[PDB]
RNA sequence: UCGGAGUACAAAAAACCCUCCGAGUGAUUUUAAUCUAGACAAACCAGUCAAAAUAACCAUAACAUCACUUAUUGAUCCAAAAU
C-alpha cells in the first residue's frame, strides 16, 4: 500500500484507515474473490472491488453512515462501560 | 391396564368432599407462587430441569476458602433492631416516604454489600460463568477479601475491573492498580490468567500477570514471576474472560520452576493450568480474593502480535452448519421447482461434452 | 331416512414424532382437534394448535405446571377458583438442541 | 471442445473460423429443420484456452 | 341477507386490485389496505361490483 | 517458522457469557400456551411480598445470576418502611448498578397488565433505565 | 412514454396520500361521533 | 393414443398434454397447480402461494406421459433466453 | 357433497337404507404482504402447518376475531372482464 505510486496520498492513507482489518504485516494490502469457477470472473471482481474503495476514499464527500441494527449494541455498552469508567483519580 | 403411581400424585392431598369449605386463591398470582415452588421441587417423572442440564444437579462441593468470620448472632441482631427502631423514629423520615421523595447514598450501600453478602453474590457471578469450572474443577471458593483492581486510561480516567464487567484492550495496555485490606504479618499472590484465547490447547490457558510474596497491601513490593502482558483476545472470537485471583499464603514461597524470563514474549512460555499450580502450592496458599472481564478484540490487539510475539495475527469466523437437506429423488412428488436448486452444487452453467 | 350424512374420513390426527427420535427444524411432532399436548422448549405451536420442532434434536415429552396467560380470560378464572394447595399440571414436548450453535474457524492469518 | 478441436488439428487456427469449418471437423452438429440457428459460444474453458 | 363481491381499487394510482366480501345493505366501502407495487398501506376504494 | 505461529484450524472458546453477548446464541423460542415466554438470555423478576420487594436477574437456567433485596442490610439500614414505592425506586437503583458491575446490559421484563399500570413498578422500570439496563433483549442472529 | 407516465401518477398520487387517509379518517371520527351522539341524545329523551 | 397413424404408420403425439405440462431432459415433467386462477378471493395468501407453484410428477405420471408423447418432445433444447436450461440436468443424485 | 359425537374403550385407519347433531354462512375490523428451510396428509387431484430472510407499519411492530370453528364448498375446458 505505501509503495504504490498509481494512488495519490491522501488516498493512500485513508484506505490504510478503513481497511485496516484487511492489510498484512508486511504492510501488503489483500482482496479475495471467491465466487465463480471461472477466474476470470474472480479476477474481475476483485478488481471491481478496488476500483470501488479507491473510488469511496477519492471522495471526500463519504460520510461513512453507520446502521443502528448491528451498532445498537455498540453504542448502548459503550455508554454503559463509560458510566464505570467514569471514576476519576490519578493513577500510575 | 391401570399401572401404580410411584411415590405421590401432585393434587392427591387436597379433600374433593366439600369443595365449598375449601379456601382458595383468587388471586392470580398466588397461583402463579405456588406455582413456581411446585416447579422448583425434585418429581419422580420425567421433567424439563431433568433433560435440560441442570448441570450436574446435586454437587457436593469441595470448598477451598477462606473461613467465614465469626460474628455474634444476638449482638448483630440487637443492633440491627436499634438502627431500625431509630430509623423508624423521625418524623422526617416518614415525610420523604409519603410524599415519594427519597434517595440511597448509593456509595455507602456499596461498601456495606461489600462487606457483608458481597462475597457471596461475586461467587455465583463467578459460577456462572465458569470460573471455577475452568479453574479448580471442582472447586467452590467464597471470595472473603475484596479485591479492587483499576486500570489507567489517562490521568484522570479510571476504569474498574468488577467481576463479569467488559473492559477494552486499550485500558488494559499497562498493568493495573491493586487494592485490598490486610495488615502485614500478610503474604500474599496476585495472579492474571486468560481462560480462554489459548491457541493449541483447549483445556489450557494464558498467565499474563502474575506476581509474589506480596507484603500487605503493597503491590509493587513483590517479587514479579511474570510480568504484565496485555490482553490479547483474537479478531474473530468474542469475549475471552480474564480472571484476577488472589491467594492469602502462610510460608514465603519459592518458585524457581513457575519463573519466567523477563521478557517473555513466548506463548508455549505462558501456558498454564491454574489447577496445577494450585495444586503445587496447595498447603501454603488459599484461594481468598476474585476479580475478572470479559474482553473482546479491538484495534490494538494487531499492534500485540506483529510487535511484541513476533507472530502474524490469526482471525476467526463464525461457521454455522450447513442446512440439512433429504435424500435427494428421482421423482420427487408435488415438490416446487426451486427443489432441484437445493442439491445444486454450484451456480455455473456447465455443458459437459458440449 | 332420519339419520344422514354421518360420514367423514378420519382427520389423522395423532403425534407424528415419539420421545426420543431425531428431528429437523420444521418437522411436525404432533397435531390435534383440541390441546392435548402442548408446545415446550424449542417447539413452535401451529395456528391449527399442531406442533412443530424449531431446532434439530431430540424429542421429549414431560409432565409440568401450567401457567396461562393472564390475557386469557377463561384459564385465569378455571386457576382462580382452584384450591389453595393444587396446581394444573399437563403434558408438553420439547426437542433438545443437538448441534452446538456454531463455530468458530480459522479464516486467514494475516 | 473448441480447444481440443484445434490441438487434435481437426479445425486449424490459420484459417478463419466459421460455421463451416466447425461442421468439418464433427465439432458440432446443426440441424436447421429444428430452428438451430447457428452456434453459441459459451466460456466453460475460458481459463484453459 | 345477501352480501356481494366489489372489486377493490388502490388511490395510489397503481393499477392494483382485491376482491371483498361487503354487506350488500351498506356504505360503500373504503379501506386501508398495502399495495405491492408502492409497497405501502395506502387508501382502496371500490371502484365496481364483481359478483352478487 | 515461529513455534509461536501455531494455532490450529478450529478455535475452542469455553467461556459460557461468549455467545450471548454476540447475540448468535439460542433463547429457547416455544411455549406460548403458557406465561410468561421463556425466550430470553437474562429476564427482570420482581417478587412483592407483604414485607420486602425483591429484584432478580435470572437466566434461563433458573440460575439467579444477580439480584437485590430489601431483606438485604445493606439496603435496609439506610431506607425506610421496607415495602413502599420508594423501596422499589431504590432496589431498581441497586441493580442496574450491581447488573452493569456484571457486564450485563440488556433483560427481558414480562409484567402482569396489573403490574404494568402500578406506580411502584413503572418508578422500577424507570430506575433501571437511567441506570442504563436496557429492557427488551436484541433479537437473535439468524434465529 | 408509459413507464414515465406510470412513474408520473405514482408519484402525483403518493404526494396526495397522507391528505387523503387524514380525511377519511376523521371523515370516519366524525361519523362515528355522529352516530354516538345519536344514540345518546335518544338515550336522553327516552330516559326523560 | 394413436399408435400407428393412417397415413404415415407413425405414432402420434396427444396435443392436450403438449398443452399442459413440460419436460425437461432428464425426464421430470412439470406441471401448474389445479385451480389456481379458480375463485382467489376465498382463498389464504398461504394457499395461494401453494397454487401458485410449478410442482413435478410422480414417476407413475411421468411415465403415462411420455408414452402419451412422441420422441420429438424429448429431445435436448437449447433456446436462446430459455428460464428452465438451468433446470435440465440433474445433479448429485445418488440412485 | 362437506363437518362433530358414537360404532372404532389406549398411535393411525376402519363399514352399514347404522345411532345422533350440524354445514351450502353470517357478524365484526385487527383488511390479515412477499419469499422460502423442513414437514403433515395423501392412489391421483386436491388439502394442511411452517423457521430463517425481505418489505409494511411501534421506528429490533406478520396467527384476522367470534358463533361447539370443525364444515360454510366445485376440476378442466369455455365464456365474459383487461391487468
Ligand atoms: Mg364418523
Ligand atoms: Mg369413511
Ligand atoms: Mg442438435
Ligand atoms: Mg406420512
Ligand atoms: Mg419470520
Known sequence: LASADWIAEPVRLKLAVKHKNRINRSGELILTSECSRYQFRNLADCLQKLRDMIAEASQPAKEPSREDAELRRSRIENMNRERLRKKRISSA | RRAAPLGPMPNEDIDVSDLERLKKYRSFDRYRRRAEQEARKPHWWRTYREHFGEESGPKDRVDIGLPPPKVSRTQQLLERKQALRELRANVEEERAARLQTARIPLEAVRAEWERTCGPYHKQRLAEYCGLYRDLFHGATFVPRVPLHVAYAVGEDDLMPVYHGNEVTPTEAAQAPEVTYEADEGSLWTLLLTNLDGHLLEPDAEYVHWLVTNIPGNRVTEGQETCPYLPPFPARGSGFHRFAFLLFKQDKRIDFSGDTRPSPCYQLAQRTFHTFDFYKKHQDAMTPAGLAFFQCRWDDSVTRVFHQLLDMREPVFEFVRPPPYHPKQKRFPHRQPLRYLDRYRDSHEPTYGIY | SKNLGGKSPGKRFGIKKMEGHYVHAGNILATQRHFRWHPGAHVGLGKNKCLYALEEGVVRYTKEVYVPNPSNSEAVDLVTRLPQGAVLYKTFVHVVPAKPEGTFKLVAML | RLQYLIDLGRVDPTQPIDLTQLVNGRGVTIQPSKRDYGVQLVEEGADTF | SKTILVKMMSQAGTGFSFNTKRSRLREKLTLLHYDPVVKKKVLFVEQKKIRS | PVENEAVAPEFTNRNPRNLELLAVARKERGWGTVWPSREFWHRLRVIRTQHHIEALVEHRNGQVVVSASTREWAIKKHLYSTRNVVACESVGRVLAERCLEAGINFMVYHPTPWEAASDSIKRLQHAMTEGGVVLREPRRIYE | ?48 | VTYFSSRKGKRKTVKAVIYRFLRLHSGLWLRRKAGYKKKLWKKTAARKRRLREFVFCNKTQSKLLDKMTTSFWKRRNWYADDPYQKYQDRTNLKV
Open chain 7, 1 to 48: 412514454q408509459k413507464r414515465q407516465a406510470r412513474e408520473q401518477l405514482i408519484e402525483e398520487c403518493m404526494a396526495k396520500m397522507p391528505q387523503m387517509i387524514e380525511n377519511w379518517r376523521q371523515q370516519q371520527q366524525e361519523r362515528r361521533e355522529k352516530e354516538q351522539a345519536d344514540k345518546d341524545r335518544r338515550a336522553r329523551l327516552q330516559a326523560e
